[PDB]
Amino acid sequence: DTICVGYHANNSTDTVDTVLEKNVTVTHSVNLLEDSHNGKLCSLNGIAPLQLGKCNVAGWLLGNPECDLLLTANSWSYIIETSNSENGTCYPGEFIDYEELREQLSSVSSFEKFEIFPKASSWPNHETTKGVTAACSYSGASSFYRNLLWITKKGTSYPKLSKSYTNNKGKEVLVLWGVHHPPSVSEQQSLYQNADAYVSVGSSKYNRRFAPEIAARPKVRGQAGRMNYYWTLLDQGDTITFEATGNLIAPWYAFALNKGSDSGIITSDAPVHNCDTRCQTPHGALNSSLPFQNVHPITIGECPKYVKSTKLRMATGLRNVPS
């Protein structure tokens, strides 16, 4: 009669790497790394994300007339760009401080788009409907942006322009405008009839005096002129003043902002569905509780942490030695 002492054996096959030996076979273990993801882009915490489609961020804010379908969007969780999004600035030029504006948009959760300067009332001196380029074409016709307004003369006359706007909404207001300059002095005089001209923008902490530059240059999209774009945040209180001679692309819609952080400009083209998660990657969504993650380093939500390994099996048990 004997009381032989022994340990437990099993028929498992999961191996665990240790220091002094590789591929050790352990009876019980536990995984610590994620691999699986559903190739979908669901809504983070109920609120659906805003898909731009074939639209750039600049194209969406300026109101590029190809980007008409998302004309009435005012709430999101995160902004999706695709690999085909190319409809930014239709008229050729440069969007000054385009990256800082993206970093400001990465903290805003909603909009309220409203009229600053009503088109039919605020401009009883100039023409407001006879100036439009053909580079930004739409179904054969020639249309301009949907948020800005071109200004032309009214019958060989151009009075000095000055217009102000106060803030009475409690929230911050994002104001865009533009400055156009033609390639030739003849085009300058034909549109504006001012050899010298300026615009000037002033609020309290923004103050600049823009003058046009006229020079011949090779054409992009069949246009030899150029146009520069600008943006400014106001505060609850302080007022903005525009004062122009012959060079103003007047604002026509603003954006009241709302805070609430943790947004993004994820660029992917995996399709959009309507489930609900707490972690979102450009490749897909993640549902887990393990402390490490392997799908993609760019995440939105409360996501597990990204490493660059392939196996993190951790042994909880004995060495499987079958006798």
Partner 1 sequence: GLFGAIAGFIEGGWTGMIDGWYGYHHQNEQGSGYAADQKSTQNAIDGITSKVNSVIEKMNTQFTAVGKEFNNLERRIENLNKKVDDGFLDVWTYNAELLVLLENERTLDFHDSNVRNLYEKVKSQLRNNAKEIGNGCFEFYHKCDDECMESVKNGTYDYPKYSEESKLNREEI
Ligand X SMILES: *[C@@H]1O[C@H](CO[C@@H]2O[C@@H](C)[C@@H](O)[C@@H](O)[C@@H]2O)[C@@H](O[C@@H]2O[C@H](CO)[C@@H](O)[C@H](O)[C@H]2NC(C)=O)[C@H](O)[C@H]1NC(C)=O
Ligand Y SMILES: *[C@@H]1O[C@H](CO)[C@@H](O[C@@H]2O[C@H](CO)[C@@H](O)[C@H](O)[C@H]2NC(C)=O)[C@H](O)[C@H]1NC(C)=O
Ligand Z SMILES: *[C@@H]1O[C@H](CO)[C@@H](O[C@@H]2O[C@H](CO)[C@@H](O[C@@H]3O[C@H](CO[C@H]4O[C@H](CO)[C@@H](O)[C@H](O)[C@@H]4O)[C@@H](O)[C@H](O[C@H]4O[C@H](CO)[C@@H](O)[C@H](O)[C@@H]4O)[C@@H]3O)[C@H](O)[C@H]2NC(C)=O)[C@H](O)[C@H]1NC(C)=O
* Cα-to-chain-centroid distance, residue 114: 20
Chain contacts with a copy of itself (rule: CB under 8 A): 92, 94, 162, 164, 200, 202-205, 207-209, 213, 215-218, 220, 226, 238-239, 241, 243
Stretch that binds partner 1, among 48-56, 148-156, 241-249, 297-305 (CB under 8 A): 297-305
State the burial class of residue 84 (Cβ atoms within 10 Å of its Cβ: 0-12, 13-18, 19+): exposed
Minimum CB distance to a copy of itself smaller for 111 or for 206: 206
**From the CB of 238, what's the least distance to ligand Z, in Å?**
9
Stretch that binds ligand X, among 15-23, 92-100, 140-148, 315-323 (CB under 6 A): 15-23
The angle formed by the CA atoms of residues 213, 214 and 216, to the nearest 5 degrees, is 135
**From the CB of 313, what's the least distance to ligand Z, in Å?**
47
Nearest one of 61, 15, 30 to 265, comparing CA atoms: 61
Residues of this chain, 194-213, that bind partner 1 according to CB under 8 A: none
Residues of this chain, 44-73, that bind ligand Z according to CB under 6 A: 64, 66
Minimum CB distance to ligand X smaller for 15 or for 38: 15
For residue 185, give every residue at least 6 positions away whose Cβ sits within 8 Å of its Cβ, in sequence order, or none: 195, 214
Indicate the SS3 state at residue 275.
Answer: strand
Minimum CB distance to ligand X smaller for 25 or for 194: 25
Tokens of 82: 């695709």
Out of 10, 14, 15, 48, name the contact with ligand X by CB under 6 A: 15
Distance, CA of 241 to CA of 102 (rounded, Å): 25
209 contacts which partner out of a copy of itself, ligand Z, partner 1, none, CB within 5 to 8 A by kind?
a copy of itself
For residue 23, give every residue at least 6 positions away whose Cβ sits within 8 Å of its Cβ, in sequence order, or none: 15, 17
Binding site for ligand Y (CB under 6 A): 11, 276, 287
